């Protein structure tokens, strides 16, 4: 199976209240395993998964050092951004940076990720070829030329094919029971009268992993788009995920609708119908 590891950095400047706050989170697939908050009484790489907490002091000290270096880099990038966009030091700003690697079913580097946005909008992203860059504006072009001059993409590739992949495999091997086991969703259909002539059919999919899932509604085997509602997939709080999709139906037509659920943990795509 194909897996993935990703790091998410968030640096927020706060003029008058000290240095910019840096928050880093590490993910294997859809399972967070580490966190680093510069506002933490003891800024140090913390584990958020049992299959990482067993690592020696080296992992945490090194991880902490790297995290701090990253934070500082984001500060310098914040200031540099202040120059590029001609902005004040009294204003607050945000820098977001996601970067990771995907491990194919074989063991080779499938995909690579290194992208960053400034103040909510795209700044610069590493293309699928992992050799070219995409800048969203004039300012990001400076950074682009910079990284084209210092061979940044090449070094980052060296990282992907190196430490990233190896550590991803280490994680997958140290916690196969939680990372490699895809759990099927508990699904069920509910009925909620919205009127004496209309009703709401809600399809529930609970406690599944990973987050990848697909819920749909069908009227007589077709596909309903009109009068439908699908909520953003949400976490259960216990490492699982939830998702429901509802449709408004004329009272007396409930038995003409079918909910279809596609999930990795499911042998065959489920088809549910309201059964009170």
């Amino acid at each position: 199976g194909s897996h993935s590891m990703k790091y998410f950095y968030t640096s927020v400047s706060r003029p008058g209240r000290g240095e910019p706050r840096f928050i880093s989170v590490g993910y294997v697939d859809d399972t967070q395993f580490v966190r680093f908050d510069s506002d933490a009484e003891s800024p140090r790489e913390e584990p958020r998964a049992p299959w990482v907490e067993q690592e020696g002091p080296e992992y945490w000290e090194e991880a902490t050092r790297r995290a701090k270096e990253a934070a500082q880099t984001h500060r310098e990038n914040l200031r540099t951004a202040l120059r590029y966009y001609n902005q004040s030091e009294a204003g607050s700003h945000t820098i977001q940076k996601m970067y990771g690697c995907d491990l194919g079913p074989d063991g080779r580097l499938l995909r690579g990720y290194h992208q960053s946005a400034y103040d909510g909008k795209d700044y610069i992203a590493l293309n699928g070829d992992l050799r070219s860059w995409t800048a969203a504006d004039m300012a990001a072009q400076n950074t682009q030329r910079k990284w084209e001059g210092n061979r940044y993409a090449e070094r980052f590739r060296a990282y992907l094919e190196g430490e990233c992949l190896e550590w991803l495999r280490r994680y997958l091997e140290n916690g196969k029971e939680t990372l490699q086991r895809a759990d099927p969703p508990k699904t069920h259909v509910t009925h909620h009268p919205v009127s004496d002539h209309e009703a709401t059919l809600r399809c529930w999919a609970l406690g599944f992993y990973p987050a990848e899932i697909t819920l749909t509604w069908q009227r007589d085997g077709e596909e309903q788009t009109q009068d439908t509602e699908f909520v953003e997939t949400r976490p259960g709080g216990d490492g699982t995920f939830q998702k429901w999709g509802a449709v408004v139906v004329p009272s007396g037509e409930e038995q003409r609708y079918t909910c279809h659920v596609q999930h990795e943990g499911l042998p065959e795509p489920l088809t549910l119908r309201w059964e009170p």
Partner: peptide, 8 residues
């Protein structure tokens, strides 16, 4: 954690 630093 990436060790190489990409400066804007």
């Amino acid at each position: 954690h990436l060790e190489v630093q990409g400066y804007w």
